[PDB]
Every structure is written in C-alpha cells, then in structure tokens.
Design a protein around this nucleic acid. Sequence first.
DNA 1: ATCAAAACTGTGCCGCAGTCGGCCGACCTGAGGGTCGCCGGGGTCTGCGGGGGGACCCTCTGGAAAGTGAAGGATAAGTGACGAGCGGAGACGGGATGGCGAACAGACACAAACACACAAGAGGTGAATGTTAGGACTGTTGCAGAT
DNA 2: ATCTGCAACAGTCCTAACATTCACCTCTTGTGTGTTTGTGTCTGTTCGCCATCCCGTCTCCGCTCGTCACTTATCCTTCACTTTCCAGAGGGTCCCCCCGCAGACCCCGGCGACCCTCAGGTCGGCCGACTGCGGCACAGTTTTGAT
Lengths: 121, 111, 97, 100, 100, 99, 83, 92
Amino acid sequence: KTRAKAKTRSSRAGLQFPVGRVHRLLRKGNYAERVGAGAPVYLAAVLEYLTAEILELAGNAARDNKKTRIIPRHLQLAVRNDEELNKLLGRVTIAQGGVLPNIQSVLLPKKTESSKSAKSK
Amino acid sequence: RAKAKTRSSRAGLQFPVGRVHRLLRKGNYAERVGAGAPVYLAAVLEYLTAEILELAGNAARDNKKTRIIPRHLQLAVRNDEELNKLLGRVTIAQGGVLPNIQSVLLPKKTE
Amino acid sequence: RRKTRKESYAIYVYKVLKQVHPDTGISSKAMSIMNSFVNDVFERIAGEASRLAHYNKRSTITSREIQTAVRLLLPGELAKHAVSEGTKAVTKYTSAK
Amino acid sequence: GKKRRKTRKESYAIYVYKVLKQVHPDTGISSKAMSIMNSFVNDVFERIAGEASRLAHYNKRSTITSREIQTAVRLLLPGELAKHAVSEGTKAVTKYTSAK
Amino acid sequence: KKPHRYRPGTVALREIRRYQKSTELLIRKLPFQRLVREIAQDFKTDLRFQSSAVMALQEASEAYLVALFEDTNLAAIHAKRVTIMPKDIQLARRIRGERA
Amino acid sequence: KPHRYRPGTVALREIRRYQKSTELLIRKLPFQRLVREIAQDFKTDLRFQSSAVMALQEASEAYLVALFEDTNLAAIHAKRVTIMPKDIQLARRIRGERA
Amino acid sequence: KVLRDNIQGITKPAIRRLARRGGVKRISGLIYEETRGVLKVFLENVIRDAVTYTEHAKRKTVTAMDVVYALKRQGRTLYGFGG
Amino acid sequence: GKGGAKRRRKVLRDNIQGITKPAIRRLARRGGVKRISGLIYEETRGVLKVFLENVIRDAVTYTEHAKRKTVTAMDVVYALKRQGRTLYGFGG
DNA sequence: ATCAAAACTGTGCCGCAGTCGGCCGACCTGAGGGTCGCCGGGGTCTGCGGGGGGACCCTCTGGAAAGTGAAGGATAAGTGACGAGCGGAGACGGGATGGCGAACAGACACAAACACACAAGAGGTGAATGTTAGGACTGTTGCAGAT
DNA sequence: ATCTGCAACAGTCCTAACATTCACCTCTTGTGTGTTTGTGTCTGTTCGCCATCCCGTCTCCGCTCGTCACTTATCCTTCACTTTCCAGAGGGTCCCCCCGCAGACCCCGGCGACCCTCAGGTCGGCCGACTGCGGCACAGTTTTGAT
Ligand SMILES: [Cl-]
Ligand SMILES: [Cl-]
Ligand SMILES: [Cl-]
Ligand SMILES: [Cl-]
Ligand SMILES: [Mg+2]
C-alpha cells in the first residue's frame, strides 16, 4: 500500500487556480534559483482574485447592456470603467474591445437652453 | 596549467569577459550560458562605452576641460540621435539640459 | 498524431467565472484575453519578485517577495484585497492540512 | 579605523578607464561621471541579458548563446548603433573561438 | 425638396456615437494587409504571414490611432479650435515622447 | 540713471543662464524637510541616507524641468507665451499621468 | 496599378472613422496625409521587431506571437492572440 | 543644563511651501519658459507632491521588504527605475 | 413657441455556428515519500552616519510699486471642411487545389555544467604629487535701453 | 543714429579638493584541467494552413457641388505678470552630541532541490447540441430642421 493519495495544494488552499502549475512555472521561468512553498499559493490566490474582479465587473457587463455571454467588449467596458483595473492595464490593448463612449462637451451644441449646467463638474 | 590567458585577451576586448559570464550565470536569465554569449555582450558594452566616451571626451575638450564630468555625458548623449533614444527614459544626475529656447520667445526683431 | 496540447488557464478562469456568474457564459476570444491577462500579471509579479530577491541577495522567491511585489504592482485597494486573499490562502493552506 | 574588512564592491570602473585612455589618452573622468558610466554599462547589460533570456523562452531553448545576444542587441539598440554593435560582437566571437 | 442636408457637424457628431459604440476594425482589411506585406518587404524578402498576425497588427494599429486621435482632439481643443490639424497630431506625438 | 530692462529680457537672460548650468535649483534643506514629511506620513521610524535625498531631488528636478518643457509647448500651441495650469494639465494628460 | 495604393490604401474615409471613434468632430484636410505617415512609422517599428523575432527562430512565416512580443517590448501590449 | 537635555522629534508641517516661487521659477527657466502664470506655483507644488509621493511610497516599500528602517539611495534608485524614470549616478 | 423628414430600437423569427457537457483517450504532470546540500533566520558586536542644534556669514526670499505688453474679447472677412447625390470599382463573401513550411520526433555528438587546486586580477588603503576646477578680483566686449 | 551702463566672458593669482600613481596587502575569483548529465543539432515525416486564381453581390470610395460655420487676422481694453528695491529670514557650512541600526560574522536547523513511481487532472478530439445570437424586416419613439 503506497498510502492513500489525493489532496491538491489548490484544495489545501481552497483555491480555484493551479497552485502546482504555478510553482512549476516559477521554478522554470528563471525567476530565482529556488521558489518557496508559500509563493505559489500566494500567487495563485492573487491571480484568482484579479480574474474574479474582472469577471465580476465583466458579468454585470452583459446585464446593464443585456446578453449572457462575455465578449471582449464587456471586458473592456469593465476595465476602463473601473479606475483601479484601468491603471493596472493602462498600457494594454484588449482586442476587439473598442473604446468608451465619450464626447467632449464643447463639440456638441445646444446653444438655446435645456438645463444650463456648469456648476457641478 | 599553461600560465593563464584571460578570456578577454583571447577576444581582444578590454571589458572582463569572465566577469560577464559570471553575472549572466547568477542573474538567472537561463539555466545554461553559452561560451560566446559573454564574449559578444562584453564586446557590445565596450563598443557602447567607447561611443559615449569618445563624444564626452570631445565635449569636455570643447569646453576647455580635461576631466569629463556628468554635464559632458549629457551633452554627448542628448546631441546624438541614437544614443538619445537608447537613453530616452534615463536621467543623468547633474547633466542639465540642452540649451534651447523656442523661437517665438525671442525678442521680436521689430520695434 | 496530436498537438503537444497547449496549457491554458481556461479551465480555472471558467470555474471562477461561475462562483461569480453561473448565469453568464464566456466568449471564445474573450477567454483568451483572460488567459493573456493572467500570464501578464503572473510575469509582472514573478519579475518584480525576482528583482526583490536579487536586490536583497537572496536565492529564493518567497511569499514575502510575492507580497511586496503585489504592493508595488497593484493600485490601492486592488492591492489591499489581493494581499488579503494572499495571506488568507497561504494560512488556510499552512494550517488546514 | 579598526579591523572590520570593508566589504568588497566591484564595478566596470577600470575597464571604462582603459577604453577612455584608448580614445582620449590625455583625458580623465570625475568620480560622478564614472559612477554614471558604471550605471550605463549595468543598465544595458540587464537590458540585453533580459531580452536574451526572454528570447530563449519563446524558443523553448534553455541556453543563452550568442544568437540570443545578437538578436537582443538588434531589438534593443537604435539604428546604426546595432549594426556597429552586431559587428563588433561577432568580430570578437570569431577572434575568440579561433585564436587560442 | 432639398438634399435635406443637416447642420455641418451633426452627422459627424452621430458618426462618433456609432463608432464609439462599435468594436470592428475601420481600416478595410485587404488594403491594410497589402500595406503590411509592403513594409515587411524591406526587412526580409519573401516571407509568409498567418492571417491572425495581420489581425493582431491591424488590431494594434487601430487602437494606437484612435488613442492618438483622442490626444490630438484634446490638443485642438486646447488651442481653442474644434478642427484637428496636423500641428496637433504632432504636439501630441512630441509630448508623448514618440517624437522625443 | 534709473535703468530697467523690458519685461522678458531678464526672463530670457535666465533661461539662458539656467540651461547652461547643472546645479540643483530647489534649495537643499527645504527640499529635504518635504521628503522627510511625505515619508514620515507613510511610515514612522524612517531615516534617510543623504544620498537618497540627493537622488530624490535629482529625479524630481529633472522631472519638473521636462514637464515645464511640454507645458511650454502646450502654451505655445495655444498661441501663448505664458504657461498656465491648463497647460500643465494637457501635458500630464497626454503623457498618460492624469488620464 | 503597380501598387498605386498600399501605403496609400488606408483611405480618407477609414481615417475619418478611426478619428470619430476617437471623438473628433471636424477634421482638417492635410490630416489624412499626416495620419498615413504616422501609421506607417508605427508599422515599420512593430514589424521590424516582429520579423526580428521570426528570423531568430529560423522561420519564414510571421506568427501572432512574433507580433505580440513585438508590441509588448514596444510597450503596446496586446491581449487576444498572445496566449 | 550641561550634559544632555533630550531633544524632541521635530514636527513637520507645510513643507511643500519650501518649494518657493523663485525655485519653481528657476526650474521653469531651465525648461525654457519665458512667462509664468500666477496660478502655476500651487499647481507645481501639487504635481511635485504627487510625484514625490509615488516614488517615496515605492522606495519605502523596498526599504521595509528588506527589514531596514533606513531608506538608501538604491531604494530610491529601484523605485525610480520601476516607474520608468531610471536614474544614473547613485549606484544601480 | 409648435410642426415635418430621418435615423436608432428592441422585438420577432430563423438559419450558421458557437460554446457545452460529456465520453473517453491519452498522456503528461503534480503529488506522495524520502534523501540531502546549503540557504536563510538568529544572536552579537559595533562603527558609521542621521537627526538635532549652535554659531556665523551672506545670499536669496518676499513684498510692495510702477509700468507695459500679453491675453482675451469683439468683430469682420475669406474659405475650408461638411452634407449629399451617385456612379462603378475593387473589397468581400464562398470554394477549391497545390505545396511550402512549421511542428514533431528519434538519436546522439559535444557543449556547458560541476569539482577543484591555484595564481594574480581586482579591490581597499594611505600617500606623495599633482593637476584642476571653484572663488574672488579685474579688464574687454556685446548689447539693451536711454536721448 | 550716438551713448551710457549693466551683463556676460576671460585672465589671473590662489588654495582646498579631487585625482592619479605608487606598492602593498588580503583574497575573491577567473582560469587550467578532467569528468559528466542532457540540450541543441540534424535528419526525417505529417499535415496544417498559407498563398491564390476564381467568381457573383454591392457596399463603399471618389468627386463635383452648394454654402455654412469655423478659423483667423484685427483692433481695443483690462490688468496680470515682469522688474526693482531692500530688509532680514533662513539656507549653507562647520562642528558636535547622542545613538539607532546597517552590515559583517558565525552557527546550524529546516527548507526546498532532486529522485522515483503513479493516479488523475488536464487537454484534444468528436458529438450532438442546447441556445446563442447576428441577419434581415416592422412599427415606434427620438430627434434635428423650419414656420
Ligand atoms: Cl515561501
Ligand atoms: Cl554562445
Ligand atoms: Cl497644421
Ligand atoms: Cl489654467
Ligand atoms: Mg506627519
């Protein structure tokens, strides 16, 4: 009996991401001679978390705009709408994500009335 | 043990080929590090070092000086298109800027 | 024969997708994007961690190095929470079995 | 002072100096200038080693060889700089794998 | 009747709204693919691509131009104008460091 | 004997003067109190080696000088020679510092 | 007609469009040409690098990765092909 | 009296005001600025504060990680380098 | 202040796929187990240099005055894009070969890793020995602003 | 158009500071020499998919036109910002006191590397395949544009 096997480090962690693949990648990416035990658990955790944050906002993407499948465009609306992710990915370009609806309030007319506003923003 | 021949002499470089090999090892860029690798890189660094030095030396000389200072490195580098791009995101402590005044700010030669 | 199989993060992303939106499905291109994102973040953190290690002349990338990296690489609360998740996961792992 | 053995710190100083002498025999360099030259060498070294390292990964190779240093140099240095540099590198590899 | 021509700018203003809500490339693919092949000719003669690469390249370049146009816009407006001229595709490139 | 240069003759005189020199332009002690204040308000038991404050000042002054360059451009682009907040803001924006 | 296009294939309309996704209302006449140049230099830098990756790899075909890596070190990182 | 009083930690406030009008004016000159708007000084004060804060934050982070209580030029150097404002002249 | 001609909008129904949940298959890989160099956490001694502060010199800041010339508002004149109607060109969808070339794949020279004595290249010290920028101190020259 | 007066440039002694040349002393560390895993080279096979003439449908690019609104050149009025004068606040330099603590050592437990099987977690096909969702058409609000 070569003893009862099982238990993935991802589980002993309660993590949805591959702790062991990650420890593998760290060891093989010439990042450092030796990689610690905690290291991959920590990295996988951070990775799962950020994935979650995007997806989360990426889901509410097809809801405030209808649809049930997450396409690039949602991811983009998600990221560029959240200050923090936007910075983290301020030098990244999501394919087929388009831009955000913005239109300099000096190009669009209205020279009549409506609701003359200039004491808010 | 036939005397001892520095990998640098074997290559005709001034920069330390051996040390470059070592730095490449310990900097973990990869498992193995080829034999030419340190030789080639040590050559490049030497070339780039001489270009900087040649121009800085000329600069020091134009300002009647004999000792290159940071200001001379700045002048050398910023007056050369290519080196300037290479060091586009670099600050040379104590080098100043290149004297340069936008034309529109010059005394209107008409009054 | 058969392709050497490309490892991806697609299974784990999809999984997570659920814990936050079972009522939502993910596109094909949109999933590579997420795959890209994770690799990026991964290398940025590993990279900084690599450097942290070398600056203090250490040969090991520990959980400490990953934490410090996160503090340097992630914006405010994004870093706050990531650090939260990090330590949490590491202890639940250290103790729990 | 007292016996403590001031830790040893190395730099490219002496080499930078040799090269300076070669191009401008009668010219010296201040310590801050030299400190700057040392930084430039290090910077470039990491800049190249790093692009090299990456190259080998993209190509599942586990060795950093002259072919990575050269591609690196080519992706990194601007215009004529690369040519001269690729030229000077190759030149030494040869003089090296040949002579002794 | 008359061509019912709207007020100069209202169509544009609307074009903006449509294109800002869109997500598909605006350069017509085939002509773009030609440009790419043309450029590459000057680096390595006779070499094949990979449909996606061209898409990647086109994807990247369009994201770049739109972004630049955003900047150029801000620049025109800064000058108190509303028409983007070249003098401001340049001030944007200059300040970004793409022209130093 | 009352003498007076016309507005902008000393300014240009100075531009010429400061672009020729390399000395730091913010005074040393004041700059250091600011660095010590900003840090302290992050972490409390810190001490700075002198060279670290010097690096910080070199990087800071180089950063502002370059920013004033771009600012000056912005002003000139607007057909002006007087720099203004709206100019620093366009610079920072296009640079990707603000938005 | 002997390449009476190519670097000139990118048309005044496409440009106006990119510029509208950009938020541009009124567009001057010499823009289309300025733009055409800019796009050119951009591609010259990206492709120069891509191909450099291709040649190092000893191939004759440019891949998505070669392009992706290029854009990466150009600081214009792209997601959606490089995985 | 004579020997050792004690000396108290100095309390720092309003130091951004040490970045005087004239110093800011001198920086603007090295940048080739002929005429400076009156509202330019508090702006500059603001931009520098933000700039210092980002660098300092990162450096302090490198200082803590190493279990030190003293900030070194290298910490400043690595913080500058990771912000894409590499600096030459203080090691590194 | 109230009417007309266009141009987005979700519904609505429906073929073209596009993601799915397996169904297993084929593996490749992460884990359970156990041996093993050597890295990193501890405890210590401890010089160096940071924070505070006095003392003195003198430079640089801050504030008020006067004057101009730069900014910006108001207006006029010349035309540069925009909106459009509209005719075809070549861009685009739909297919079918023809083969270069990229992705494996098995096999094995050598190339680079280690292991180790062993010298001397390189670094840290004090030190004459100079050479050299940096601070007054004065003249020459260029030039801006006053008659 | 000459004239005066202030600013920037050069020279010249002058002494402190920074360098360079010794030459000596440790000593990390690169090189010389010999074995020893295994990675990159090279040869050989499969088919993925890139290059490409081919061929209807027409969307979309070009162009000439009409003319409006945006840009720019002027002319004016207002006042914001540059120059200057000058007292004296406080930075700079030197020198000191008091310690905090960076960093060189040394000693040695763990920790993470490196092995070796093995079960299964992960990937690539196919397979319906459930629904997913753009692809045309309708009538309904939502506007710009004029009376
Ligand atoms: Cl760890
Ligand atoms: Cl090699
Ligand atoms: Cl223009
Ligand atoms: Cl303003
Ligand atoms: Mg405080």
